[PDB]
Design a protein around this ligand. Structure first.
Ligand SMILES: Nc1ncnc2c1ncn2[C@@H]1O[C@H](COP(=O)(O)O)[C@H]2O[B@-]3(OCc4cc(F)ccc43)O[C@H]21
Length: 252
């Protein structure tokens, strides 16, 4: 399974405003969330944006009790089978929305120390994995770092504005092998120049995880100074207790 991170949609992008208005779904009154799937809840302090795929047609689903989730239909269907939605096996969204239509939207990500976060495009989101929504932690995720780099280097070309992408990375996890921004270290060390270098990125991802999780120390938050291995389950439970996240499993 995954930890679903409830990223609050505070302001919708101009191209999506006419869509949300037609549905009578005010993001100021109602709680509309992009639900990002993560296995690294301890890294939520370093969220710099939320990624959606331009290729994916997301659903806006009734999550019950005034909540609304933006995910793939596959993911929401899975959530319905484990008491996270109003009705078991019901997964028709209120409406469908392409990832491109959400780009530029403003969001509030749980535990993120950086402010003024935006929804940005990620071309390499695997549509059949998790929720199809990926939160961006460039300090420790090689995929997120390489995607952020390309967006920051040619923002207008990528259909975004300069101020929407954040490059001033706040360190979250200290490591002995790769310093305090292991993803930056590893992307440079392995000379990964494109987000589509899947084989090398998978290598970097695993190296970053093993060192950061098993040997890393938290640099921020309630568990600053603690080993990541000890802190991670505590951060996860805190997020769940505070209504900012939840766990959900998949078939098989
Ligand atoms: N549909 C998708 N397409 C591409 N990537 C996706 C995705 N859904 C989630 N992810 C990414 O893969 C991680 C789980 O890795 P495995 O399952 O073990 O491969 C998740 O945790 B992680 O979230 C924040 C984070 C920080 C970090 F320092 C490292 C990783 C992540 O990035 C997410």
């Amino acid at each position: 399974g995954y930890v679903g991170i409830k990223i609050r949609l505070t302001d919708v992008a101009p191209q999506a405003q006419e869509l949300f208005k037609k549905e009578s779904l005010d993001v100021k009154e109602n709680k509309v969330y992009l639900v990002a799937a993560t296995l690294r809840p301890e890294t939520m302090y370093g969220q710099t944006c939320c990624f959606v795929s331009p290729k994916i047609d997301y659903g806006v689903f009734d999550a019950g009790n005034g909540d609304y989730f933006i995910t793939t239909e596959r993911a929401f269907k899975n959530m319905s089978f484990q008491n996270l939605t109003p009705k078991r096996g019901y997964y028709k969204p209120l409406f469908t929305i392409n990832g491109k239509t959400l780009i530029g939207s403003r969001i509030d990500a749980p535990y993120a120390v950086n402010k003024n976060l935006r929804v940005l495009p990620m071309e390499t989101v695997l549509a059949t994995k998790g929720t199809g929504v990926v939160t961006c932690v460039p300090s420790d995720s090689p995929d997120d770092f390489v995607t952020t780099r390309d967006l920051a280097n040619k923002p207008e070309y990528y259909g975004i504005e300069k101020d929407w992408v954040q490059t001033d990375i706040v360190p979250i996890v200290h490591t002995e092998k790769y310093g305090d921004k292991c993803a930056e270290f590893l992307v440079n060390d392995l000379k990964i120049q494109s987000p589509k270098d899947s084989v090398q990125l998978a290598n970097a991802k695993e190296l970053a995880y093993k060192e950061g999780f098993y040997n890393g120390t938290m640099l921020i938050g309630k568990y600053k100074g603690d080993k990541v291995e000890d802190a991670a389950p505590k951060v996860k439970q805190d997020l769940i207790d505070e209504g900012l996240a939840f766990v959900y499993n998949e078939p098989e």
